[PDB]
Design a protein around this ligand. Structure first.
Ligand SMILES: CCCCCCCCCCCCCCCC(=O)O
Ligand SMILES: CCCCCCCCCCCCCCCC(=O)O
Lengths: 317, 319
């Protein structure tokens, strides 16, 4: 019955079932040595930051649990990041995840979504929220039919590079290109290579999870998931016309995220995205493949253009 | 005469004698017409004067001394050694004094072919000794040799472009290249003159198009500091842009060079082709050639870069 504790889910604070719904509150001390390093995924202006993928992992966990006890794909949807979470590492820093569900009398078994909120307590700060959904395989089946199409897009990008049309970045050079904006926890530096067609903010990347350490138990390793979103972040910020000393594209959230095959830390995967031009926001889909197999998919991944200076000022505040 | 220019403000001392002579000139790097120019690179928020700044002044005091001791010449800024960083504070006057000294037999001075030059800052009524070099009134032997190798340099350049066209080498557009180096150093906009650069990392070999029309370069000079620094930037980028070089830990910085000659004016409206093969203690060296189509424009022989810890660099500059 009880939910399994993991590297990213440490304790159950509250769990109460009710006739018209239920509530599940879990806790994670992001200062604990087995997870503190992981909670510090990005580094901006010397300030450590927790990535959206961190919340997504916990969401999948409390979602998969809730879905299994009222009765198989869990979609971490409508992800919204409101305030940065800085893992200070000075004693306990409790991140509380609250999941809530509602349903008509004796109809709990048909519930297909739940609201999730993420906030730290010493209330400290409300950081993010999302809606976990127990979705259908309609999208998966659709993606499977488009596999050859994605493969062709990927192939065309490599052919373009082979003709000197698009840039191909080796891992260390790509991270170097982004280094004035942000540095990454070594365990998060999983992009092996990336071919970028700047004209369409379109990229094909090889992500190799064997390039980092990922010990622990998770639903979806935060480093693996963040790596997937990094392909889109790089596609935007690596454009010749984007001056990262003045304006940069940062994570905002996403509309939908589904994983169909476990994210193996010994394997490499192919990631493809065409973000496009796009007010203040840009959005696009990101697909992950393992050869001919559909592994995961972000629908509506959203990035926001913000002043580099303002970003710094806020983080330093 | 010793015409004053944007980088040479006034004569502090000039004494000619039987066994030689001395020429001391002064440059207030805070003056509005040259202050921005003296701030070529920015490392950890600290502005830095580039070696090319000294080279410009050296060419000036050198050309002057040369044309003066003769009844009529290529000036080589050789043995350039940069000892201490020069940080243009912009807090009032900052006097950079250039001292040139010559020596010769009692017979005739018209045969003098070199002069010692030193660069150091002094307060208003010594601050730090920054660099030194030996200006030489050289022959055209090297120029003639370089002209015979033009087709060879052209082929190296062509091969780099052909490699890129096959996906073998990286080609960096101007802004992307500066972005790649931005965590290590930022540049005065007038110094961001590299239009594109094709790099063969295996041999730290690069072919770059430098376009002087990409920056502002108003004023009078012998060799504009931004133009000359841009030439050396091709080699600096070739080294620091290697995938195996982690600029968060180690970086290749300017050290100086053995020889530098300019054969054609460095026109601020033109673009030029720059080629270097730096190849593999803590020092690396190589030659850098500048072409204008089929014409040899300039040449650095023995340009030297030094590998230094990124953090140590920061600590030193902050001090
Ligand atoms: C082969 C390329 C390797 C380099 C990959 C770099 C990934 C860059 C991702 C840019 C987004 C990071 C910006 C941090 C701010 C934020 O999103 O909250
Ligand atoms: C097309 C490429 C454009 C980018 C050109 C970047 C030139 C980088 C040069 C690296 C040397 C700069 C290091 C400063 C420290 C020093 O030399 O004293």
């Amino acid at each position: 019955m009880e939910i399994k504790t993991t590297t990213t889910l440490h304790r159950v604070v509250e769990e109460t079932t009710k006739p018209l719904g239920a509530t599940l509150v879990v806790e994670t001390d992001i200062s604990r040595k087995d997870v503190n390093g992981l909670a510090r995924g990005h580094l901006v202006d010397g300030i450590p930051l927790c990535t959206p993928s961190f919340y997504a992992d916990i969401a999948m966990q409390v979602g998969q649990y809730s879905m299994q006890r009222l009765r198989g794909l869990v979609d971490v949807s409508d992800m919204v990041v409101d305030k940065a979470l800085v893992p200070h590492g000075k004693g306990p820093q409790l991140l509380r995840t609250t999941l809530t569900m509602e349903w008509p009398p004796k109809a709990a078994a048909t519930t297909r979504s739940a609201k999730v909120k993420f906030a730290t307590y010493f209330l400290d700060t409300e950081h993010a929220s999302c809606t976990v959904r127990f979705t259908s395989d309609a999208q998966l089946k659709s993606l499977r039919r488009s596999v050859s199409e994605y493969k062709t897009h990927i192939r065309q990008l490599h052919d373009g590079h082979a003709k000197g049309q698009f840039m191909r970045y080796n891992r260390k050079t790509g991270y170097k290109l982004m280094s004035s904006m942000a540095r990454f926890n070594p365990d998060y530096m999983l992009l092996d290579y990336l071919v970028l067609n700047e004209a369409e903010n379109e990229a094909a990347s090889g992500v190799d999870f064997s390039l980092g350490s990922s010990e622990g138990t998770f639903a979806a390793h935060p480093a693996h998931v963040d790596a997937i979103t990094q392909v889109a972040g790089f596609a935007m910020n690596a454009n010749d016309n984007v001056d990262i000393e003045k304006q940069v594209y940062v994570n905002h959230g996403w509309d939908s995220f589904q994983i169909y095959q476990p994210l193996d830390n010994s394997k490499s995967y192919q990631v493809y995205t065409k973000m496009g031009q796009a007010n203040d926001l840009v959005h696009g889909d990101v697909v992950v493949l393992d050869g001919e197999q559909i592994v995961a998919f972000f629908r509506g991944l959203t990035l926001r253009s913000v002043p580099r200076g303002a970003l710094r000022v806020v983080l330093q505040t």
